[PDB]
Amino acid sequence: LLDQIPSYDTHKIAVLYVGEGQSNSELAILSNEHGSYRYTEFLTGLGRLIELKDCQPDKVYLGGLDVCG
Amino acid sequence: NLAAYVPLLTQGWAEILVRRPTGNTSWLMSLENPLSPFSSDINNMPLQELSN
Amino acid sequence: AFDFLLLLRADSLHRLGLPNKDGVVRFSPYCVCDYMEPEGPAVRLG
Amino acid sequence: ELQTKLEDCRNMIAELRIELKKANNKVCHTELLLSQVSQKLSNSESVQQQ
Amino acid sequence: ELQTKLEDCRNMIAELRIELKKANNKVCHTELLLSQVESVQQQ
């Protein structure tokens, strides 16, 4: 169990893209599959892009994202 | 990368030698901790260490 | 006068806008922030 | 009527951006695939010499 | 009318054309893939 307490502060940060008129629609924000080009480029700067099926959650913090895809 | 991977490979190797009243014990040692990509020298960080 | 003027805004196609009676900005199709230099034909923007 | 045209064009733009997401996701996927291939080739050369 | 025609101008003239250019970018990186495309470790 201690080995499962990480040696580093793990943080999980949500990222949401709000399209036109979705400022008050949770279901519409969550339904978003694409984003504006600026939003796509903004995502690329957040960190390393890690493919989940290659990740080990003990080594790379996935925050609860499933490896299975 | 020729000047990089050998120094990266070696610098975890060590010997701890305990001299005691009854003798000396020593182990050659080699760290399992890799060099941190986030805090090593920022000139170049190739993954050839893991390749070897 | 400043309190009104400083609420002037514009968009990526340069159309100027001011808050309406509800405080929501509308952008004009006829007024643009582009400094026009003085130094059939379509509608001429201001 | 022009509002109907606007909603039609917005539907078209939504499907175009779905296509953009599909294309960019394929770009990311095959970029990671070719990155893995490059790593594999370099590792293979080093491994043969080793 | 102002809002409808202005937002339709935005869509059709900026967004639609930028998306066509992004489809061009799609085929560009697809060409990158199409042009960019053993067990010795055991021993």
UniProtKB/Swiss-Prot annotation, chain A:
Changing residue 15 to I: In FCORD2; somatic mutation; decreased function in negative regulation of TOR signaling; does not affect interaction with TSC1. Phosphorylation by AMPK activates it and leads to negative regulation of the mTORC1 complex. Ubiquitinated by the DCX(FBXW5) E3 ubiquitin-protein ligase complex, leading to its subsequent degradation. Ubiquitinated by MYCBP2 independently of its phosphorylation status leading to subsequent degradation; association with TSC1 protects from ubiquitination. Changing residue 62 to M: In TSC2; uncertain significance. Liver, brain, heart, lymphocytes, fibroblasts, biliary epithelium, pancreas, skeletal muscle, kidney, lung and placenta. It is found in: Lysosome membrane; Cytoplasm, Cytosol. It is linked to Tuberous sclerosis 2: An autosomal dominant multi-system disorder that affects especially the brain, kidneys, heart, and skin. It is characterized by hamartomas (benign overgrowths predominantly of a cell or tissue type that occurs normally in the organ) and hamartias (developmental abnormalities of tissue combination). Clinical manifestations include epilepsy, learning difficulties, behavioral problems, and skin lesions. Seizures can be intractable and premature death can occur from a variety of disease-associated causes. Lymphangioleiomyomatosis: Progressive and often fatal lung disease characterized by a diffuse proliferation of abnormal smooth muscle cells in the lungs. It affects almost exclusively young women and can occur as an isolated disorder or in association with tuberous sclerosis complex. Component of the TSC-TBC complex (also named Rhebulator complex), composed of 2 molecules of TSC1, 2 molecules of TSC2 and 1 molecule of TBC1D7. Probably forms a complex composed of chaperones HSP90 and HSP70, co-chaperones STIP1/HOP, CDC37, PPP5C, PTGES3/p23, TSC1 and client protein TSC2. Probably forms a complex composed of chaperones HSP90 and HSP70, co-chaperones CDC37, PPP5C, TSC1 and client protein TSC2, CDK4, AKT, RAF1 and NR3C1; this complex does not contain co-chaperones STIP1/HOP and PTGES3/p23. (Microbial infection) Interacts with human cytomegalovirus protein UL38; this interaction inhibits cellular stress response mediated by mTORC1. This is Tuberin. It comes from Homo sapiens (Human).
From Swiss-Prot, chain D:
This is Hamartin. The chain holds residues 795 to 844 of 1164 of the full protein. It is found in: Lysosome membrane; Cytoplasm, Cytosol. Component of the TSC-TBC complex (also named Rhebulator complex), composed of 2 molecules of TSC1, 2 molecules of TSC2 and 1 molecule of TBC1D7. Probably forms a complex composed of chaperones HSP90 and HSP70, co-chaperones STIP1/HOP, CDC37, PPP5C, PTGES3/p23, TSC1 and client protein TSC2. Forms a complex composed of chaperones HSP90 and HSP70, co-chaperones CDC37, PPP5C, TSC1 and client protein TSC2, CDK4, AKT, RAF1 and NR3C1; this complex does not contain co-chaperones STIP1/HOP and PTGES3/p23. It comes from the Eukaryota. Changing residue 17 to G: In TSC1; uncertain significance; no effect on expression; no effect on subcellular localization; no effect on inhibition of TORC1 signaling. The C-terminal putative coiled-coil domain is necessary for interaction with TSC2. It is linked to Tuberous sclerosis 1: An autosomal dominant multi-system disorder that affects especially the brain, kidneys, heart, and skin. It is characterized by hamartomas (benign overgrowths predominantly of a cell or tissue type that occurs normally in the organ) and hamartias (developmental abnormalities of tissue combination). Clinical manifestations include epilepsy, learning difficulties, behavioral problems, and skin lesions. Seizures can be intractable and premature death can occur from a variety of disease-associated causes. Lymphangioleiomyomatosis: Progressive and often fatal lung disease characterized by a diffuse proliferation of abnormal smooth muscle cells in the lungs. It affects almost exclusively young women and can occur as an isolated disorder or in association with tuberous sclerosis complex. Non-catalytic component of the TSC-TBC complex, a multiprotein complex that acts as a negative regulator of the canonical mTORC1 complex, an evolutionarily conserved central nutrient sensor that stimulates anabolic reactions and macromolecule biosynthesis to promote cellular biomass generation and growth. The TSC-TBC complex acts as a GTPase-activating protein (GAP) for the small GTPase RHEB, a direct activator of the protein kinase activity of mTORC1. Highly expressed in skeletal muscle, followed by heart, brain, placenta, pancreas, lung, liver and kidney. Also expressed in embryonic kidney cells.
